[PDB]
Design a binder for this molecule. Structure first.
Ligand SMILES: [Ca+2]
Ligand SMILES: [Ca+2]
Ligand SMILES: [Ca+2]
Ligand SMILES: [Ca+2]
Ligand SMILES: [Ca+2]
Ligand SMILES: [Ca+2]
Ligand SMILES: [Ca+2]
Lengths: 83, 146, 149, 130
């Protein structure tokens, strides 16, 4: 109704926008968050693995000493066993 | 090889608007703007090359059927990188060949966004791969490529 | 290769690479690699990270394959000071920062690792290594649990 | 204290040898604690550390076999030969019943791999006679 075909240029500024947001979002919204997101998943990994290593070292030793201990008494009888 | 629905629509959407007189044809005048909307800036005489080529009378008008094909094949021969390269320039308003803090500061507000300078600093600091605190073209291409 | 890596350490490298391959091509770009290094506790300066991928690429592009990750890290880990690592593991047990791993502590860890243990057993663990006799494990006691075996 | 008997001489060696877990010719607390259970000795936590403290003139909390030999040696001879017996009895008695039954004996027989009434008069008293 009103206005010219400078509006063709009011349509470029707008097309350049649908693309600005497009690339701005894949940059930020998508891509840059993974810098925080996986940065956390990284800590959580480190952490979990750190725990696991120490805990597995702890518990298996306990298991061995129990298991050894109950073999020491076993052993101690084996002398008196043969009367 | 085949146009996306977004692409197909674009063509139609453009040829629809710059057809001032609804009449179904675009004259030279109408075409020049049509192609500049779709992103193309051809030499004025090359636009006339087109009209005349696809024009079986001394009429000087282009049918939609012909626009679609001409534009269509002009869209596919599009270099993927040209789009990316022409994307950089919209951020680099100053045209320094490097994307700045204040550059993005201008984008974010223009895209209706509230983000601290740490949020923005974070965005650059991550992709700045030489240490100058700013994104040159290669790095920007990278951001985009997969 | 050398001083053979621990079964727990192999799984470290694998799991890390497997988890940060954001796509699963068997490859890692700078970004994919930076976090993967944090996960093995190896935060490097940016420069040297780029330096590293380059070093490992005659094939042009900017990546790293498991094959070589598995090794760079392999020696990165060996070079590792064992004492700082234990010290760090201690802190994680001690959520409440009391200076000693209590049984509430140990239980929390043990649930966190999806183990199910009877409290009689948690107390068994603590007792065997509680040399100062106060029924919790302090730093020096923990170190000794992890010292070598 | 006498010249320590050969039969017991080996038992000492066997103890030390059999229970050096990491196999570094020394015992540390944990190993030492199990090592002595093989010779019947079950000492207070405090006590054990005490020993390691005494003979670890080495520094860094270990025990050389020589020291170990010296110690357990006196302990074996200077031990109430009936306390020796007492612990043995306490060990067959899983269920802490007071009398050893076969579920506390085959328990041992099996746990190492006829004449039921052999030494039965029906306890700790019948024990020492063997
Ligand atoms: Ca028209
Ligand atoms: Ca700029
Ligand atoms: Ca740069
Ligand atoms: Ca990948
Ligand atoms: Ca605590
Ligand atoms: Ca303690
Ligand atoms: Ca040892």
């Amino acid at each position: 109704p009103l206005g010219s075909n400078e509006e063709a240029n009011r349509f470029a500024n707008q097309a350049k926008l649908r693309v600005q947001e497009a690339v701005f979002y894949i940059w930020s919204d998508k891509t840059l968050k993974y810098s925080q997101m996986a940065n956390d998943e990284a800590e959580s990994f480190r952490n979990t693995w750190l725990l696991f290593r120490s805990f597995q070292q702890w518990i298996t030793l306990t298991q061995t000493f129990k298991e050894q201990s109950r073999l020491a008494d076993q052993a101690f009888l084996n002398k008196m066993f043969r009367k | 090889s085949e146009l996306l629905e977004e692409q197909k629509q674009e063509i139609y959407e453009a040829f629809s608007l710059f057809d001032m007189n609804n009449d179904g044809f675009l004259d030279y005048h109408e075409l020049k703007v049509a192609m500049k909307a779709l992103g193309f800036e051809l030499p004025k005489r090359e636009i006339l090359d087109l009209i005349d080529e696809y024009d079986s009378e001394g009429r000087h008008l282009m049918k939609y059927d012909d626009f679609y094909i001409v534009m269509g094949e002009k869209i596919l021969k599009r270099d993927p990188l040209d789009e990316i390269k022409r994307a950089f320039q919209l951020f680099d308003d100053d045209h320094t060949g490097k994307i700045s803090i204040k550059n993005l500061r201008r984008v974010a507000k223009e895209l209706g966004e509230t983000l601290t300078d740490e949020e923005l600093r974070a965005m650059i600091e991550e992709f700045d791969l030489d240490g100058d605190g700013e994104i040159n073209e290669n790095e920007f291409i990278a951001i985009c490529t997969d």
